[PDB]
């Protein structure tokens, strides 16, 4: 009888439910069917309501009564979600008890304006020496992880999460960083294995995993990045620092293409809807560093875009690259060359990371990147331009040692005090004597002995983090003592 | 007729409003759906579907909208506060401040949509603008009171190039300025807003000089498509009513065309090539023609243009070429080498490359530079296969000169202090004319090619040569 | 007298590479015209 807060279903098909009634329903309002399946009403038409399903269409028949929820799609937030595996809606799926909720934040929240923002200066050490030295990331920055299939995009994001363990032991809040991993379109076994990998390093108890596997309905895969961002936006608004990794956005646009094409919304380029750019624009823009009057918190977003044959000119990636504050291109061709991570430095770049990079590294990394900027040009032509000229051949025996030094095994984040000695031995070229077969093992115990030799040389960086001219006189005294090993 | 109308349907960012007969609002009007507080929802009338039904485009988010709510008709397009009181304020497309520094002081109000100046009132201005960059004020000089475009894809140095032109011109230029941001990053506006408070252009103690109207990429496509028409209204008021020479930096104008494609699909339009809207040249032409220098005042515009996937054949930038007086194409291959600015020294053209504007001297200097760089690019295969030894004695010298030139084209920008650590260097216009001739003649054919990287002027190349030799 | 044998075979192996890269270009153009028109036909005949 009443069709203002309830309504009967006209037709349900492939997750799309057209319901008659709901005269007082809002746009993007969560609804509840008579079979426990949720859903939100995207397009409010004249005489009917287009509702997508957060589940299966098997339990819904024609004429099913549809109760409302009277609220836009919101999700639980707070610190009581740290260490829990949840879906896109917020319901726990790890089985470790229900979710204690502090407050709730909408899934579709407008990004903060200009004035509540401030210039980024807080660093975010990923642990990778090839990243923090060449493409530094600040807190509130948008650094894209774009690459082809199985080139190391996921493993780079994990190394950033595992690296932030050494700051969750202390009490300093400016260095704290809580991680968020939003699995979009993956399989149940991969995400579950990723949880145990994060539980194998005590990295789960400060990170929140939002699982939207491939079996779930397309509205769930679409909403998972937005809900994950809102769950990390709670830390931003309360002064704390947060980090979220979208893995990935290339499969989210596929799910958003289903909701659009099945709600009879007109398609655009490459069968994707028109606002496929606005799908990602309002998502990454919600990550920034805010004023001290607004809390002083920061949320950093790491999106992942899987290309097809290195095609950086495809529809979806060209949009994302135009949004982020830089990208980290992973070329599958450099992976077999030995370079791991296969970071094509000639294309990856950060923008406002130069002033966010550590001062102890900027003192040695500012010139370091430009040594490879020359090396990629000369090393590519030593048999094509077949002229045996030893005039500028010194750059070849210099870059091949540092580019081989940028290697780093999987899930092995090197600390700031563990990376600065290696770079100084590379920029100066004082390790060119050792062959290309023992340099990878030279680094293995060049870091370990420095702890036993001078444990008071790492406690200063743990408090200050800056190396002055005094240590420059000591580094020269440390260098010459271990050149014969 | 200001009254009420009811919502019939809400689909994404497209909301249709049902009106009563003889109360139908005209097209390009402003409809207000009342939310209790400020920053209430505004709608832009796009089509007359018939049966007293109007299809509008949202200027904000449509979440929370309920079918049947009343919709007010202001009987006029989106009218923004215009005047000298807009300087130093951060305003959205609706005409409301978002810097929470209070209301906007103004008297006369003007709509965002207006007919462009007729052919009888057009003004022909062939005036050179002294920028401060060597490659700019040589090969492709900018035209004061004209329309300048910056191209290239994502990561070639378009926004940094603008932040450099602000530092150089906004204080050398006497008239006011309007910086409208169309669908760009929000932090880049904040990183620019702080520099406004420190450059002296914007101050909170005294009345500022520039107006900031920003419509970021987080705002729905209805806002990005009309925010360029908002900042344009402020510039035209300084041209028609104040009669001042105004700077109109647009970044980025590609989002205006892109936002029109995200709405055209939902408005039931047959998609054109590359998923673009049928009203491609007209919608751009209805904005590029209003940005022109009339006989009352003058408006200079430096519009950065994003190039999708580095594809200059894309319909969006290709239509922009016909509107610009001077183009500055940024090639990605130049950025990969480490040369900034990545201005393509052959594709960057200008209308003021004539002997009637700068003289026969400047026109002949820039002519030999391009011929040299074209002859150097013609020998790209030989150098990589036959080496330097297998060349004639004439083009050998040109190769030795072109390498010095294209490395001397690079200039450390004042904003590029954080990217290179090198202090910014600024040169004049006529200093570059004699500096290149001393390179083309052979007077300075003894200095190394690495002494031209990141230096400004020819008298500084020698200063670096003495230190590097020792 | 052996440079030519390394420059004559470099001409018959380049021509054998031009043909295979001229047919592929005609294939890719033929794929662009369709996969873009189909993208228009889908969007146009959606109404």
């Amino acid at each position: 009888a009443n069709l203002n807060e309830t309504g009967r279903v006209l037709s349900v098909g492939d997750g799309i439910a057209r319901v008659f009634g709901l005269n007082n329903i809002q746009a993007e309002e969560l609804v509840e069917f008579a079979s426990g399946v949720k859903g939100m009403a995207l397009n409010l038409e004249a005489g009917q309501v287009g509702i997508v399903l957060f589940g299966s269409d098997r339990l819904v028949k024609e004429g099913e009564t549809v109760k409302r929820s009277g609220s836009i799609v919101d999700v639980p937030v707070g610190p009581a979600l740290l260490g829990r595996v949840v879906d896109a809606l917020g319901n726990p799926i790890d089985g470790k008890g229900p979710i204690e909720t502090e407050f709730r934040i909408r899934a579709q929240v407008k990004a903060p304006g200009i004035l509540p923002r401030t210039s980024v200066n807080e660093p975010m050490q990923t642990g990778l020496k090839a990243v923090d030295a060449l493409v530094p990331i600040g807190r509130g920055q948008r650094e894209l992880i774009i690459g082809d299939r199985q080139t190391g995009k996921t493993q780079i994001a994990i190394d950033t999460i595992l690296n932030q363990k050494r700051w969750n032991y202390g009490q300093d809040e400016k260095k704290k960083l809580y991680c968020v991993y939003v699995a979009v379109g993956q399989k149940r076994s991969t995400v579950a294995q990723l949880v145990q990998t994060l539980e194998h390093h005590d990295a789960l108890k400060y990170s929140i995993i939002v699982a939207a596997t491939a079996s779930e309905a397309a509205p769930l895969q679409y909403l998972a990045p937005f809900t994950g961002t809102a769950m990390g936006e709670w830390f931003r608004d309360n002064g704390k620092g947060a980090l979220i990794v979208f893995d990935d956005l290339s499969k989210q646009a596929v799910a958003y293409r289903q909701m659009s094409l099945l709600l009879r919304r007109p398609p655009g380029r490459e069968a994707y809807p028109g606002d496929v750019f606005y799908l990602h624009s309002r998502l990454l823009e919600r990550a920034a560093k805010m004023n001290e009057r607004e809390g002083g918190g920061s949320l950093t977003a790491l999106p992942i875009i899987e290309t097809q044959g290195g095609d950086v000119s495809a529809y979806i990636p060209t949009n994302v690259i135009s949004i982020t504050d830089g990208q980290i291109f992973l070329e599958a061709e450099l992976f077999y060359k030995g370079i791991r991570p296969a970071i094509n430095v000639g294309l990856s770049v950060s923008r406002v990371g130069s002033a966010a990079q550590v001062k102890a590294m900027k003192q040695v990394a500012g010139s370091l990147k430009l040594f490879l900027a020359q090396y990629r040009e000369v090393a590519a032509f030593a048999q094509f331009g077949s002229d045996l000229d030893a005039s500028t051949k010194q750059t070849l025996t210099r870059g091949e040692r540092l580019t081989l030094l940028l290697k780093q095994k999987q899930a092995s984040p090197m600390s700031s005090e563990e990376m600065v000695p290696l770079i100084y031995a590379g920029v100066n070229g004082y390790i060119d004597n050792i062959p290309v077969k023992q340099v990878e093992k030279f680094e293995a115990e060049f870091v370990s002995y420095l702890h036993a030799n001078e444990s008071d040389l790492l406690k200063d960086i743990a408090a200050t983090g800056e190396l002055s001219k005094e240590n420059l006189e000591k580094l020269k005294s440390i260098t010459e003592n271990f050149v014969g090993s | 007729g200001v009254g009420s109308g009811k919502i019939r349907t809400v689909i994404g960012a497209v909301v249709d409003v049902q009106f009563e007969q003889d109360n139908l609002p005209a097209i390009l009007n402003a409809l207000t759906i009342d939310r209790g507080e400020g920053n209430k929802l505004v709608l832009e009338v796009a089509q007359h579907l018939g049966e007293n039904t109007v299809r509008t485009i949202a200027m904000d988010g449509t979440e929370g909208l309920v079918r049947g709510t009343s919709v007010a008709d202001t009987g006029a397009p989106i009218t923004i506060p215009v005047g000298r009181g807009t300087l130093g304020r951060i305003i959205n497309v609706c005409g409301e401040p978002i810097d929470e520094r209070g209301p906007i002081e103004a008297t006369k109000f003007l709509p965002i949509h207006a007919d462009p100046p007729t052919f009888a009132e057009q003004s022909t201005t062939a005036e050179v603008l002294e920028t401060g960059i060597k490659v700019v004020d040589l090969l492709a000089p900018y035209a004061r009171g004209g329309k300048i475009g910056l191209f290239g894809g994502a990561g070639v140095g378009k926004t940094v190039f603008i932040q450099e032109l602000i530092n150089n011109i906004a204080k050398a230029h006497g008239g006011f300025s309007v910086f409208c941001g169309v669908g760009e990053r929000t932090r880049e506006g904040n990183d620019l807003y702080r520099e406004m408070k420190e450059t002296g252009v914007i101050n909170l103690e005294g009345e500022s000089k520039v107006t900031l109207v920003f419509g970021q990429m987080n705002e729905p496509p209805g806002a990005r498509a009309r925010v360029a028409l908002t900042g344009l209204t402020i510039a035209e008021y300084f041209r028609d009513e104040e009669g001042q020479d105004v700077l109109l930096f647009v970044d980025n104008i590609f989002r205006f065309t892109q936002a029109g494609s995200e709405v055209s699909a939902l408005l039931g339009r047959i998609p054109s090539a590359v998923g673009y809207q049928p009203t491609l040249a007209t919608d751009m032409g209805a904005l590029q023609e209003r940005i022109t220098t009339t006989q009352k005042g003058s408006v200079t515009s430096v519009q950065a243009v994003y190039v999708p996937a580095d594809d200059l054949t894309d319909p969006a930038p290709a239509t922009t070429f016909a509107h610009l007086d001077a183009t500055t194409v940024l090639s990605r291959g130049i950025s990969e080498l480490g040369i900034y600015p990545a201005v393509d020294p052959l594709d960057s053209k200008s209308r003021l490359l004539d002997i009637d504007v700068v003289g026969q001297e400047h026109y002949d200097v820039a002519s030999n530079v391009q011929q040299t760089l074209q002859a150097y690019k013609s020998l790209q295969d030989i150098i990589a296969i036959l080496g330097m030894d297998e060349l004639s004695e004439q083009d050998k010298l040109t190769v030795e000169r072109a390498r010095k030139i294209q490395r001397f084209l690079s200039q450390p920008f004042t904003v590029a202090e954080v990217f290179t650590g090198i202090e910014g260097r600024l040169v004049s216009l006529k200093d570059t004319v004699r500096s290149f001739k001393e390179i083309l003649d052979g007077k300075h054919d003894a200095l190394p090619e690495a002494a031209f990287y990141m230096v400004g002027g020819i008298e500084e190349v020698v200063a670096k040569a003495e230190k590097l030799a020792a | 007298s052996a440079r030519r044998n390394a420059m004559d075979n470099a001409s018959k192996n380049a021509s054998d590479m031009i043909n295979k890269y001229s047919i592929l270009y005609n294939r890719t153009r033929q794929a662009v015209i369709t996969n873009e028109l189909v993208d228009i036909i889908t969007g146009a005949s959606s109404l």
Binding site: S313 | - | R4, M7, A10, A14, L24, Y25, V32
Partner: peptide, 27 residues
Amino acid sequence: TLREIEMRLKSIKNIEKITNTMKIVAS
């Protein structure tokens, strides 16, 4: 891809310009 085909054509088509003009020069 499509963008690089014509780019890779102009290289190979102009490599033919070099090798064919080094067979008679050696004669």
